[PDB]
Design a binder for this molecule. Structure first.
Ligand SMILES: *[C@@H]1O[C@H](CO)[C@@H](O)[C@H](O)[C@H]1NC(C)=O
Ligand SMILES: *[C@@H]1O[C@H](CO)[C@@H](O)[C@H](O)[C@H]1NC(C)=O
Ligand SMILES: *[C@@H]1O[C@H](CO)[C@@H](O)[C@H](O)[C@H]1NC(C)=O
Ligand SMILES: N[C@@H](CCC(=O)O)C(=O)O
Lengths: 45, 81, 53, 305, 212
């Protein structure tokens, strides 16, 4: 995906809703957040 | 639903040690502390886009049918008399 | 005219408050007492509904 | 103060310490003089303060009146009073008698309809009683009242504790707000909270985590924030470090590891307790007053005739 | 309530204006008694029926709010166990005590995370559980922590008292001895056999299970 493309050299910056976590942070350097959120569940009513 | 678990953020990914890191982070902070992110939220996300007819619609229809039936019965009684 | 022995039916019907034609009241004291008893019956049926809930 | 820092930033910049654990927001000047780790709790700045049913019923009532007129045509004084009798029997008021079979059947059916309608109205009253709402006076830092209190009819008061990130941000953003705010620079959260109770002050502007906690552990539940909060400068708390310190990578990874498996949620539950009457019918009484005013106006209109 | 008195004033005003309208329309005691019969249960008749509808809506709303007042807003005289924040951070209002120098004291002292409760309880520790129950019966105490069996029997004896829901620190009762002693294996086997047959059930029926 996008992380593989960035690491392989085909891109220089990822501008997309990318989440910050340990496995990704070990290999690339994020910036400070521009959007704070969590997770939730969608149901039909 | 209600619950909100695993709260995290969104980032602008980069390479490893790269010359465009500190400036990008500072620009993000400077856009946060003034109203630019509020303007973006207004334009894109924040912008937004009893009844008594649930259990009584069929009841009302059946009542109307019964009224029609009663009118027909009245006509039948008039014909009988 | 006949509310000597027929007042029991009127009072019992107004206990349930079903608007059943029983007798036309004339006495002021009787009307006031019946109104108070009807209010008591209404609050009693409210309490009964709360008990059912 | 004249290219001189103080406090935790002062102790970190001048090498008297290596990191500053305590609560400490993130903004541009501090990020320029020191290095912050990833945020582990989010705190912005926020504010703390103390139709056709009737039409179809009328149509059905007209149908009932027409049926009563037809009954009168077939086979006494209930021609124009049919509506009066029907609507009186709606509420079962025993107002001082149907005789025709069709009229009695229609009256009984409409009485059953009124019974189910009053049951639905009781259900609606129960739902309204279950529903509970608070009142918010200020919408945001840029509210109409906050625009110019002197312009507004009451000159209400609102202040924050000076020498802070919040004061600095408000100064940079809106100078007039700071100009008016200067008059009520109440010091300390605890001292500040009291003036809010007594009414000498009306609004309070501070962090969001602090106000959330102090509303949570308040006795009586009188003070309530406005909406969700974080209504501006949504920022977080960081662990300051000296520039280029070799601990930054390890501390960042450890904080992410803690966040990613619920330990931070456990700590939040343990150390922050977020909780959450009397009869009132003001709106109903106002509606009744309006309806009776309309009724008496109609009676006055019919007075000449 | 006060709203009830205000509604009484409003219905009196409505009756007065109805009397005035009757006088103006081209009798007195009759209208007064009609108002008496209507407020409690041809121009003026429309107003009367509308006001009767208002009265029905008002009595319905009053029934709803009294039902809410008797159902929802009920004081929580219970504590629901140790998980009450009101006891996590105590004050001078809720007085929860125990028996001085017993198992409960050891349990609370051992856990350092209950240091606040341990410091709070040390002022009200009582010499005996009979005294503690007497004090709480005299409205001096607000809560009491003790063994489940004793508390349930006391509640059954005296119906004014009620227990809580939570059940924590489950243990048993034993028969103490010296150190390694000849009377141990046989005593334990006797206890096991008494459990497996019906003797402990008989004892519980005769002494604890019965209701006064
Ligand atoms: C990024 O910010 C630093 C601050 O130390 C500054 O020296 C540098 O010039 C900035 N980047 C660019 C491309 O100017
Ligand atoms: C702190 O606030 C007081 C009161 O306005 C002011 O006199 C003082 O100069 C401030 N100190 C700093 C370091 O901002
Ligand atoms: C009871 O104890 C005696 C010794 O005191 C022992 O010999 C005997 O076996 C015991 N009974 C048992 C184990 O059932
Ligand atoms: N924790 C915040 C408080 C802001 C304020 O007190 O205004 C800071 O140190 O910047």
């Amino acid at each position: 995906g996008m992380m593989g493309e960035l690491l392989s050299g085909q891109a220089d910056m990822i501008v997309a809703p990318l989440t910050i976590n340990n496995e990704r942070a070990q290999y690339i350097e994020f910036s400070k957040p521009f959007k704070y959120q969590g997770l939730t569940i969608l149901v039909k009513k | 639903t209600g619950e909100l678990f695993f709260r995290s953020g969104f980032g602008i990914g980069m390479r490893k040690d790269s010359p465009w890191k500190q400036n990008v982070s500072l620009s993000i902070l400077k856009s946060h502390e003034n109203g630019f992110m509020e303007d973006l939220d207004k334009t894109w996300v924040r912008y937004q886009e009893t009844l008594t007819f649930e259990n009584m619609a069929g009841v009302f229809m059946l009542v109307a049918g019964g009224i029609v039936a009663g009118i027909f019965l009245i006509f039948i009684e008039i014909a009988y008399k | 005219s006949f509310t000597i022995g027929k007042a029991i039916w009127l009072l019992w019907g107004l206990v349930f408050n079903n608007s059943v034609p029983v007798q036309n009241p004339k006495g002021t004291t009787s009307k006031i007492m019946v109104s108070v008893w009807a209010f008591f019956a209404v609050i009693f049926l409210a309490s009964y509904t709360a008990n059912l809930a | 103060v004249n290219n001189v820092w103080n406090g935790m930033i002062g102790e970190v910049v001048y090498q008297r310490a290596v990191m500053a654990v305590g609560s400490l927001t993130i903004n541009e000047e501090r990020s320029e003089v020191v290095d912050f780790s990833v945020p582990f709790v989010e705190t912005g700045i926020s504010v703390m303060v103390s139709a056709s049913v009737w039409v179809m019923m009328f149509v059905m009532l007209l149908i009932v009146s027409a049926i009563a007129v037809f009954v009168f045509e077939y086979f006494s004084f209930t021609i124009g009073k049919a509506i009066w009798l029907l609507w009186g029997l709606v509420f079962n008021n025993s107002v001082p008698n149907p005789k025709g079979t069709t009229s009695k059947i229609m009256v009984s059916v409409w009485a059953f309809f009124a019974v189910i309608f009053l049951a639905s109205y009781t259900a609606n009253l129960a739902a309204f009683m279950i529903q509970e709402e608070f009142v918010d006076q200020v919408t945001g830092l840029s509210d109409k009242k906050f625009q110019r209190p002197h312009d507004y009819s009451p000159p209400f008061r609102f202040g924050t504790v000076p020498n802070g990130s919040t004061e600095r941000n408000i100064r940079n953003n809106y100078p007039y707000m700071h100009q008016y705010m200067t008059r009520f620079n109440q010091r300390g959260v605890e001292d500040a909270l009291v003036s809010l109770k007594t009414g000498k002050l009306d609004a309070f502007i501070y962090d969001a985590a602090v106000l959330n906690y102090k509303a949570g552990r308040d006795e009586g539940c009188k003070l309530v924030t406005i909406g969700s909060g974080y209504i501006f400068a949504t920022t977080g708390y960081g662990i300051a470090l000296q520039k280029g310190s070799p601990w930054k990578r390890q501390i960042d990874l450890a904080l992410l590891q803690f966040v990613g498996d619920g330990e931070m949620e456990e700590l939040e539950t343990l150390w922050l307790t977020g909780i959450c009457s009397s009869q009132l019918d003001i709106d109903n009484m106002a509606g009744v007053f309006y309806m009776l005013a309309a009724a008496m106006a109609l009676s006055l209109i019919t007075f000449i005739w | 309530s006060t709203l009830w008195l205000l509604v009484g004033l409003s219905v009196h005003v409505v009756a007065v204006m109805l009397y005035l309208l009757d006088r103006f329309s081209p009798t007195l005691s009759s209208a007064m008694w009609f108002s008496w019969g209507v407020l409690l249960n041809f121009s003026a008749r429309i107003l009367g029926m509308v006001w009767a509808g208002f009265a029905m809506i008002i009595v319905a709303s009053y029934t709803a709010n009294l039902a809410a007042f008797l159902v929802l807003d009920r004081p929580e005289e219970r504590i629901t166990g140790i998980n009450d924040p009101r006891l996590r951070n105590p004050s001078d209002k809720f007085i929860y005590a125990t028996v001085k120098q017993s198992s409960v004291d050891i349990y609370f002292r051992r856990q350092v995370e209950l240091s606040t409760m341990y410091r709070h309880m040390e002022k009200h520790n009582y010499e005996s559980a009979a005294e503690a129950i007497q004090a709480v019966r005299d409205n001096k105490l607000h809560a009491f922590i003790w063994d489940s069996a004793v508390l349930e029997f006391e509640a059954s004896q005296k119906c004014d008292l009620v227990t809580t829901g939570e059940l924590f620190f489950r243990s048993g009762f034993g028969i103490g001895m010296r150190k390694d002693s000849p009377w141990k294996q046989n005593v334990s086997l006797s206890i096991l056999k008494s459990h497996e047959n019906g003797f402990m059930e008989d004892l519980d029926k005769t002494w604890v299970r019965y209701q006064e």
